[PDB]
Amino acid sequence: SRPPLEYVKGVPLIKYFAEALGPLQSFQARPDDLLISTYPKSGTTWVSQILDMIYQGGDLEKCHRAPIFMRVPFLEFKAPGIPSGMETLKDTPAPRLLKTHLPLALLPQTLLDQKVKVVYVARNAKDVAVSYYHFYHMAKVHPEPGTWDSFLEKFMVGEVSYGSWYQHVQEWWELSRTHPVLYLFYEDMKENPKREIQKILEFVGHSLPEETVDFMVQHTSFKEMKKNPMTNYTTVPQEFMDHSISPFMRKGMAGDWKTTFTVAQNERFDADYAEKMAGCSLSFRSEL
Ligand SMILES: Nc1ncnc2c1ncn2[C@@H]1O[C@H](COP(=O)(O)O)[C@@H](OP(=O)(O)O)[C@H]1O
Ligand SMILES: C[C@]12CC[C@@H]3c4ccc(O)cc4CC[C@H]3[C@@H]1CC[C@@H]2O
């Protein structure tokens, strides 16, 4: 029950994912692949749906062909009895959309060699932290979260699945100076989706009718993605994800962190944060 994390090259990984890193060393990326990269709980499921929808030419029905995680293979994914993303990936027709949360240290080198385009989504740390906490309770493969207070503690030192969020956002921020990486912010997508969805289109080449963009905007909203079983993850074994404790689609909001963080925590955290994001131009909005 609740296996513990396995460290690989300094990164804490879910046992099953750590295992998957081996076959993964055989992954050959295609020049037309598109990688969705994010630190967990930063809008991955959200941007995947937008991308898939764009790829299907705005066709809602085609996007309903199967579970978002089947449509957009999860690269380092592996679970007992379930087909690894690697497996699933050889059954996937190009152009392909792939997702990952792995830090550069562990990113299959083939994707950089093949100069594969990257859509990266970042989210303010406080919200990611609250979100990850609840996610740790409902996604059975993670270790015990404990109290929210001890978790925040773990979070700060990077002792959580996929490690430091601080390092994660900075390293991909850096990568973007020399690699094709569209770096988006969750908060911006919340503020003005249509504006962000446009940036994505420009970045991936495709170009659709304003009448089409608005259609997506509606369909890739929290309300809509919450009820759609092809994106809310309510279609996976209750053993893996128990939505009754906390649903995958929880709130969908920027700023929800204020109702969980205490004043003590908020104080300790901002002190620690000022240190870790020192000489970095990266900047985050914590509300709105
Ligand atoms: N279309 C959408 N618009 C806004 N937030 C969304 C969304 N789809 C999912 N989310 C939220 O984004 C986070 C996505 O997690 P992941 O990065 O693993 O896909 C969760 O955050 P909350 O738990 O704060 O709601 C989820 O509920
Ligand atoms: C909970 C699982 C491991 C963690 C996976 C994850 C991990 C991080 C994240 O941001 C999103 C997801 C979506 C699918 C999750 C998986 C569903 C099956 C597996 O047990």
Coordinates of C-alpha atoms and ligand atoms in Angstrom, one line a residue:
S1 CA 0.0 0.0 0.0
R2 CA 1.4 3.4 -1.0
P3 CA 4.8 2.4 -2.1
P4 CA 7.6 4.8 -1.3
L5 CA 9.5 7.0 -3.9
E6 CA 12.5 5.7 -5.7
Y7 CA 15.3 8.2 -6.3
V8 CA 17.0 8.1 -9.7
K9 CA 19.8 10.5 -10.6
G10 CA 18.7 12.7 -7.7
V11 CA 15.0 12.7 -8.6
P12 CA 12.2 11.2 -6.5
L13 CA 10.0 9.0 -8.8
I14 CA 7.0 6.8 -8.3
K15 CA 8.2 3.2 -8.2
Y16 CA 6.4 2.2 -11.4
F17 CA 7.7 5.3 -13.3
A18 CA 11.3 4.7 -12.2
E19 CA 11.0 1.2 -13.7
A20 CA 9.7 2.5 -16.9
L21 CA 12.8 4.7 -17.4
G22 CA 14.6 1.6 -18.8
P23 CA 12.6 0.7 -21.8
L24 CA 12.3 4.4 -22.4
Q25 CA 16.0 4.5 -23.2
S26 CA 14.9 3.0 -26.5
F27 CA 12.4 5.7 -27.5
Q28 CA 13.1 7.3 -30.9
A29 CA 11.4 10.7 -31.3
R30 CA 10.1 11.9 -34.6
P31 CA 10.9 15.4 -36.0
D32 CA 7.2 16.1 -36.1
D33 CA 6.5 15.1 -32.5
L34 CA 5.2 17.6 -30.0
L35 CA 6.1 17.4 -26.3
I36 CA 3.8 18.8 -23.6
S37 CA 6.0 19.4 -20.6
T38 CA 4.9 20.5 -17.1
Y39 CA 5.6 20.0 -13.4
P40 CA 2.6 18.1 -12.1
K41 CA -0.7 19.9 -11.4
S42 CA 0.2 22.8 -13.6
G43 CA -2.3 22.5 -16.4
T44 CA -1.1 19.4 -18.2
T45 CA -4.6 17.9 -18.7
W46 CA -5.9 21.3 -19.7
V47 CA -3.3 22.0 -22.4
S48 CA -3.4 18.5 -23.7
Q49 CA -7.1 18.8 -24.5
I50 CA -6.5 22.1 -26.3
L51 CA -3.7 20.5 -28.3
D52 CA -5.6 17.3 -29.2
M53 CA -8.6 19.4 -30.2
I54 CA -6.4 21.6 -32.4
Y55 CA -4.9 18.5 -34.0
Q56 CA -8.4 17.1 -34.7
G57 CA -9.2 20.4 -36.4
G58 CA -11.7 21.6 -33.8
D59 CA -13.7 18.4 -34.1
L60 CA -15.3 17.7 -30.7
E61 CA -16.4 14.2 -31.6
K62 CA -13.0 13.0 -32.7
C63 CA -11.6 14.3 -29.4
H64 CA -14.0 11.8 -27.7
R65 CA -12.4 8.8 -29.3
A66 CA -10.7 7.8 -26.0
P67 CA -9.4 9.1 -22.6
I68 CA -7.1 12.1 -22.9
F69 CA -4.2 9.9 -21.5
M70 CA -4.7 7.5 -24.4
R71 CA -4.9 10.3 -27.0
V72 CA -1.8 12.0 -25.6
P73 CA 0.6 9.2 -24.4
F74 CA 2.2 9.7 -21.0
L75 CA 5.9 9.0 -21.8
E76 CA 7.3 7.6 -18.5
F77 CA 4.0 6.1 -17.6
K78 CA 3.6 2.6 -16.2
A79 CA 1.1 1.0 -13.9
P80 CA 0.6 -2.7 -12.9
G81 CA -1.5 -4.4 -15.6
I82 CA -1.9 -1.2 -17.6
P83 CA 0.0 -0.6 -20.9
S84 CA 3.0 1.6 -20.5
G85 CA 3.0 4.9 -22.4
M86 CA 5.9 3.4 -24.4
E87 CA 3.7 0.6 -25.5
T88 CA 0.8 2.9 -26.2
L89 CA 3.2 5.2 -28.1
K90 CA 4.0 2.7 -30.9
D91 CA 0.2 2.4 -31.5
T92 CA 0.0 6.2 -32.0
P93 CA 0.0 7.8 -35.4
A94 CA 2.0 10.9 -36.2
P95 CA 1.9 13.7 -35.8
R96 CA 2.0 12.7 -32.2
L97 CA 1.4 14.6 -29.0
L98 CA 3.4 13.3 -26.0
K99 CA 3.3 14.4 -22.3
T100 CA 6.0 14.3 -19.6
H101 CA 6.8 15.7 -16.2
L102 CA 10.4 14.5 -16.1
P103 CA 13.2 17.0 -15.4
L104 CA 15.8 17.5 -18.1
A105 CA 18.2 15.3 -16.2
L106 CA 16.1 12.4 -17.2
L107 CA 14.6 13.5 -20.4
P108 CA 15.2 11.0 -23.2
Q109 CA 18.0 12.7 -25.2
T110 CA 16.4 11.8 -28.5
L111 CA 13.8 14.6 -28.1
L112 CA 16.4 17.3 -27.9
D113 CA 18.4 15.8 -30.8
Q114 CA 15.3 15.6 -32.9
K115 CA 14.7 19.3 -32.0
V116 CA 11.1 18.4 -31.0
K117 CA 8.8 21.4 -30.3
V118 CA 7.8 21.9 -26.7
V119 CA 4.7 23.3 -25.1
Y120 CA 5.5 24.0 -21.4
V121 CA 3.1 25.1 -18.8
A122 CA 4.0 26.7 -15.5
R123 CA 1.9 27.5 -12.5
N124 CA 2.5 29.6 -9.3
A125 CA 4.0 27.3 -6.7
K126 CA 1.5 27.9 -3.9
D127 CA -1.4 26.7 -6.0
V128 CA 0.6 23.8 -7.4
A129 CA 1.4 22.8 -3.8
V130 CA -2.2 22.8 -2.7
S131 CA -3.3 21.0 -5.8
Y132 CA -0.6 18.4 -5.5
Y133 CA -1.5 17.8 -1.8
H134 CA -5.1 16.8 -2.7
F135 CA -3.8 14.9 -5.7
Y136 CA -1.6 12.9 -3.3
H137 CA -4.7 11.8 -1.4
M138 CA -6.7 10.6 -4.4
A139 CA -4.0 9.1 -6.6
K140 CA -3.1 5.9 -4.7
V141 CA 0.3 5.3 -6.2
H142 CA 1.9 8.2 -4.3
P143 CA 3.3 7.8 -0.8
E144 CA 1.2 9.0 2.1
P145 CA 0.8 12.8 2.0
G146 CA 0.4 13.2 5.7
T147 CA -0.9 16.5 7.1
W148 CA -1.0 19.5 4.8
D149 CA 1.6 21.0 7.0
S150 CA 4.2 18.3 6.6
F151 CA 3.6 18.0 2.9
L152 CA 4.3 21.7 2.3
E153 CA 7.5 20.9 4.1
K154 CA 8.3 18.1 1.7
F155 CA 7.3 20.3 -1.2
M156 CA 9.7 23.0 -0.3
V157 CA 12.8 20.7 -0.3
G158 CA 11.7 18.8 -3.4
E159 CA 11.0 15.6 -1.6
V160 CA 7.9 14.8 -3.7
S161 CA 7.3 12.8 -6.8
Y162 CA 9.2 14.6 -9.6
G163 CA 11.2 16.7 -7.1
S164 CA 11.7 20.4 -6.9
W165 CA 9.2 22.5 -8.6
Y166 CA 11.7 25.4 -8.3
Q167 CA 14.3 23.7 -10.4
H168 CA 11.8 22.3 -12.8
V169 CA 10.4 25.7 -13.9
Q170 CA 13.8 27.3 -14.1
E171 CA 15.5 24.7 -16.2
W172 CA 12.9 24.6 -18.9
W173 CA 12.8 28.4 -18.7
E174 CA 16.5 28.3 -19.6
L175 CA 16.1 25.6 -22.3
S176 CA 13.8 28.0 -24.2
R177 CA 16.7 30.2 -25.2
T178 CA 18.1 27.5 -27.4
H179 CA 15.2 25.1 -28.1
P180 CA 11.8 25.5 -29.6
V181 CA 9.8 25.9 -26.4
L182 CA 6.5 27.8 -26.0
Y183 CA 6.5 28.7 -22.3
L184 CA 3.0 29.3 -21.0
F185 CA 1.6 30.2 -17.6
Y186 CA -1.5 28.6 -16.1
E187 CA -2.6 31.9 -14.7
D188 CA -2.6 33.5 -18.1
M189 CA -4.6 30.7 -19.6
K190 CA -7.2 31.4 -16.8
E191 CA -7.2 35.1 -17.4
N192 CA -7.6 35.1 -21.2
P193 CA -7.8 31.6 -22.8
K194 CA -8.5 32.7 -26.3
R195 CA -5.3 34.8 -26.1
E196 CA -3.3 31.8 -25.1
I197 CA -4.9 29.3 -27.5
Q198 CA -3.9 31.7 -30.2
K199 CA -0.3 31.6 -29.2
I200 CA -0.4 27.9 -29.3
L201 CA -1.8 27.8 -32.8
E202 CA 0.8 30.2 -34.1
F203 CA 3.5 28.0 -32.4
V204 CA 2.2 24.7 -33.9
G205 CA 1.6 26.0 -37.4
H206 CA -2.1 25.1 -37.7
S207 CA -4.5 28.1 -38.1
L208 CA -8.2 28.1 -37.4
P209 CA -11.3 30.4 -37.8
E210 CA -12.2 32.7 -35.0
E211 CA -15.5 30.9 -35.0
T212 CA -13.5 27.7 -34.2
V213 CA -11.2 29.2 -31.5
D214 CA -14.3 30.3 -29.5
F215 CA -15.8 26.8 -29.8
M216 CA -12.6 25.4 -28.1
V217 CA -12.5 28.0 -25.5
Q218 CA -16.0 26.8 -24.4
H219 CA -15.1 23.2 -24.5
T220 CA -11.8 23.5 -22.7
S221 CA -13.3 25.2 -19.7
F222 CA -13.2 23.8 -16.3
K223 CA -16.9 23.4 -16.2
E224 CA -16.9 21.4 -19.5
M225 CA -13.7 19.4 -18.9
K226 CA -15.1 18.5 -15.5
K227 CA -18.2 16.7 -16.8
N228 CA -16.5 15.2 -19.8
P229 CA -15.4 11.6 -18.8
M230 CA -12.8 11.7 -21.6
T231 CA -10.9 14.4 -19.7
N232 CA -11.9 14.3 -16.0
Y233 CA -10.1 10.9 -15.4
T234 CA -13.2 9.2 -13.8
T235 CA -12.7 6.3 -16.1
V236 CA -9.7 4.7 -14.4
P237 CA -9.7 1.9 -11.8
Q238 CA -10.9 3.2 -8.4
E239 CA -7.7 1.4 -7.0
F240 CA -5.6 4.0 -8.8
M241 CA -7.7 7.2 -8.4
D242 CA -10.5 7.5 -5.9
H243 CA -12.4 10.6 -7.0
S244 CA -14.6 10.4 -3.9
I245 CA -11.7 11.7 -1.8
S246 CA -10.7 14.5 -4.2
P247 CA -11.7 14.6 -7.9
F248 CA -9.0 15.1 -10.5
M249 CA -10.7 18.3 -11.6
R250 CA -10.8 20.0 -8.2
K251 CA -11.4 23.8 -8.6
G252 CA -9.6 25.0 -11.6
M253 CA -8.7 28.2 -10.0
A254 CA -5.8 30.7 -9.6
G255 CA -5.6 31.9 -6.0
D256 CA -7.3 28.9 -4.2
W257 CA -4.1 28.6 -2.2
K258 CA -5.2 31.4 0.2
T259 CA -7.8 29.2 1.8
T260 CA -5.3 26.5 2.8
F261 CA -2.0 28.3 3.6
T262 CA -1.9 29.7 7.1
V263 CA -0.1 33.0 7.8
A264 CA 2.8 31.1 9.4
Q265 CA 3.2 28.9 6.3
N266 CA 2.8 31.8 3.9
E267 CA 5.5 33.6 5.8
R268 CA 8.0 30.8 5.9
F269 CA 7.3 30.0 2.3
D270 CA 7.7 33.4 0.8
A271 CA 11.0 33.7 2.7
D272 CA 12.2 30.4 1.2
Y273 CA 10.9 31.4 -2.2
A274 CA 12.8 34.6 -2.4
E275 CA 15.9 32.6 -1.9
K276 CA 15.3 29.9 -4.5
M277 CA 14.2 32.3 -7.3
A278 CA 17.0 34.7 -6.9
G279 CA 18.7 35.7 -10.1
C280 CA 15.8 34.5 -12.3
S281 CA 13.7 36.7 -14.6
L282 CA 10.9 34.1 -14.3
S283 CA 7.9 35.8 -12.7
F284 CA 4.6 34.3 -11.3
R285 CA 1.1 35.7 -10.4
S286 CA -0.4 34.2 -7.3
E287 CA -4.0 35.3 -7.9
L288 CA -6.2 36.3 -10.9
Ligands
LIG1 N1 -9.7 23.4 -18.4 C1 -9.2 23.7 -17.2 N2 -9.2 25.0 -16.8 C2 -8.6 25.3 -15.6 N3 -8.1 24.4 -14.7 C3 -8.1 23.1 -15.1 C4 -8.6 22.7 -16.3 N4 -8.5 21.3 -16.4 C5 -7.9 20.9 -15.3 N5 -7.6 22.0 -14.5 C6 -7.0 21.9 -13.2 O1 -5.6 22.0 -13.5 C7 -4.8 21.1 -12.6 C8 -4.4 20.1 -13.6 O2 -3.6 19.1 -13.1 P1 -2.5 18.4 -14.2 O3 -1.3 19.5 -14.3 O4 -2.1 17.2 -13.5 O5 -3.3 18.2 -15.4 C9 -5.9 20.7 -11.5 O6 -5.9 21.9 -10.6 P2 -6.8 22.2 -9.2 O7 -6.6 20.9 -8.5 O8 -6.2 23.3 -8.6 O9 -8.2 22.3 -9.7 C10 -7.2 20.7 -12.3 O10 -8.4 20.6 -11.6
LIG2 C1 -2.5 8.0 -10.5 C2 -1.6 7.6 -11.8 C3 -0.1 8.0 -11.6 C4 0.1 9.6 -11.7 C5 -0.4 10.2 -13.0 C6 -0.3 11.7 -13.0 C7 0.8 12.4 -12.3 C8 1.0 13.8 -12.4 C9 0.1 14.6 -13.1 O1 0.2 16.0 -13.1 C10 -1.0 14.0 -13.8 C11 -1.2 12.6 -13.8 C12 -2.4 12.0 -14.5 C13 -2.5 10.4 -14.5 C14 -2.0 9.8 -13.2 C15 -2.1 8.2 -13.2 C16 -3.5 7.5 -13.3 C17 -3.1 6.0 -13.1 C18 -1.8 6.1 -12.1 O2 -2.1 5.2 -11.0

